[PDB]
Each structure stands twice: as structure tokens, then as C-alpha cells.
Amino acid sequence: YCIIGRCDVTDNQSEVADKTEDYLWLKLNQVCFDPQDRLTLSQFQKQLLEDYGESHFTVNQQPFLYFQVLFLTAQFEAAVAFLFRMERLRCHAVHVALVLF
Amino acid sequence: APPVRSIY
């Protein structure tokens, strides 16, 4: 219902969206464009990394999980710098920067 | 309260 109506943005529907990708997909189907019970890409993209930074998404020591969160929200610079710090994934982060360049 | 469990 609230995937069709883009409502109840605060309720993460955790009963059915238990994975991270299920959350991203749940919200990107809820973002809106031009006051209550409404979320926009700017709020969502900022809300995610500002409040729930790397710390929240890298506790499982899985780096790509956070990268996908930033890249699939149009925050390409964040995801590039972030992934560029993983000494094992420097190569990959430089190139995804070149492509964007 | 988003989960941190990656789709595996």
C-alpha cells in the first residue's frame, strides 16, 4: 500500500524489508519531488550517511554494502572516497572515479 | 532503523 502510495516513510516495513537492498528499494519507491509524511532524495541521501554513517553500514566488515548505499543514492563522490580508503579496493575506487570523470 | 545485513 505505501509502496504504491509512497506513505509511512518512517515505517521501514522491517517485517518484509529485512535486507539492506530491500530498504533502499523500499525508500526509493517512497521518495517524492515537490510537507508531512514525505521524503525527498536530498533528505534521504543526506539522512542516510549523516545520521547512519560508515559506522552503521560497516559493522559487519562488508565494504561494498556501504558503497552500494552511496552509489545507488547518487552520492558518487562519497562512495568513491569511501571505497578509495579500503587498501584492498583502491584500484576499483579510482576507476569508478575515472568513469564518472 | 535500516538493517545492515547485505543480501547474500
Coordinates of C-alpha atoms in Angstrom, one line a residue:
Chain A
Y1 CA 0.0 0.0 0.0
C2 CA 2.7 2.5 1.0
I3 CA 4.9 1.4 -1.9
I4 CA 2.1 2.4 -4.2
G5 CA 1.2 5.5 -2.2
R6 CA 4.7 6.4 -1.0
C7 CA 3.4 6.8 2.5
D8 CA 4.5 6.0 6.0
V9 CA 8.1 6.9 5.1
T10 CA 9.2 6.5 8.7
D11 CA 8.0 2.9 8.9
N12 CA 10.7 0.8 7.3
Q13 CA 8.3 -2.2 6.9
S14 CA 11.0 -4.2 8.6
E15 CA 8.7 -7.3 8.6
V16 CA 9.2 -7.7 4.8
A17 CA 12.3 -5.5 4.1
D18 CA 14.9 -7.2 6.3
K19 CA 17.9 -6.8 3.9
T20 CA 19.7 -3.6 3.1
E21 CA 18.8 -3.6 -0.6
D22 CA 15.2 -4.2 0.4
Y23 CA 15.4 -1.0 2.4
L24 CA 17.0 1.1 -0.3
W25 CA 14.4 -0.2 -2.8
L26 CA 11.6 0.4 -0.2
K27 CA 12.6 4.0 0.1
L28 CA 13.5 4.9 -3.5
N29 CA 9.9 3.8 -4.1
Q30 CA 8.9 6.4 -1.5
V31 CA 11.0 9.4 -2.3
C32 CA 9.0 12.4 -3.6
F33 CA 9.5 15.7 -5.5
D34 CA 7.7 19.0 -4.8
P35 CA 5.0 18.7 3.7
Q36 CA 4.1 15.9 6.1
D37 CA 4.8 12.2 5.7
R38 CA 7.1 13.0 2.7
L39 CA 10.7 12.2 1.9
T40 CA 12.9 13.6 -0.9
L41 CA 16.1 12.3 -2.4
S42 CA 18.1 15.1 -0.8
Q43 CA 16.8 14.3 2.6
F44 CA 17.1 10.6 2.2
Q45 CA 20.6 10.7 0.7
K46 CA 21.8 13.1 3.5
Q47 CA 19.7 11.4 6.2
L48 CA 21.4 8.1 5.5
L49 CA 25.1 9.0 5.7
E50 CA 24.9 11.9 8.1
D51 CA 22.9 10.0 10.8
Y52 CA 23.9 6.4 9.9
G53 CA 27.4 6.9 8.6
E54 CA 30.0 4.3 7.6
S55 CA 30.0 3.1 11.2
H56 CA 26.4 1.8 10.9
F57 CA 26.9 0.1 7.5
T58 CA 30.4 -1.3 8.0
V59 CA 30.0 -3.1 11.4
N60 CA 29.7 -6.4 9.5
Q61 CA 33.1 -5.7 7.9
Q62 CA 31.5 -5.8 4.4
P63 CA 32.6 -2.7 2.5
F64 CA 30.6 -2.9 -0.7
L65 CA 27.3 -2.8 1.3
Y66 CA 28.0 0.9 2.2
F67 CA 29.3 1.6 -1.3
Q68 CA 26.0 0.4 -2.8
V69 CA 24.1 2.6 -0.4
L70 CA 26.0 5.7 -1.5
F71 CA 26.2 4.8 -5.2
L72 CA 22.5 3.9 -5.6
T73 CA 21.6 7.2 -4.0
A74 CA 23.6 9.4 -6.5
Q75 CA 26.3 10.2 -3.8
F76 CA 29.1 9.1 -6.1
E77 CA 31.8 11.3 -4.6
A78 CA 31.2 9.9 -1.1
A79 CA 31.2 6.3 -2.3
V80 CA 34.4 6.9 -4.3
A81 CA 36.4 8.4 -1.5
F82 CA 35.0 5.8 1.0
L83 CA 35.9 2.9 -1.2
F84 CA 39.2 4.5 -2.1
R85 CA 40.3 4.2 1.6
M86 CA 40.0 0.4 1.6
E87 CA 43.6 -0.5 0.8
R88 CA 42.3 -3.7 -0.9
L89 CA 39.9 -1.8 -3.2
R90 CA 41.9 1.2 -4.2
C91 CA 42.1 0.0 -7.8
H92 CA 38.3 -0.2 -8.1
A93 CA 37.6 3.1 -6.5
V94 CA 40.0 5.0 -8.7
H95 CA 38.4 3.6 -11.9
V96 CA 34.8 4.2 -10.8
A97 CA 36.1 7.7 -10.4
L98 CA 37.5 7.8 -13.9
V99 CA 34.2 6.6 -15.4
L100 CA 32.4 9.3 -13.5
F101 CA 35.1 11.7 -14.8
Chain B
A1 CA 16.3 1.7 11.7
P2 CA 17.7 0.3 8.4
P3 CA 19.3 -3.2 8.5
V4 CA 23.0 -3.8 7.8
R5 CA 22.5 -7.4 6.6
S6 CA 23.6 -7.5 3.0
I7 CA 21.6 -9.6 0.5
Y8 CA 23.5 -12.8 0.4

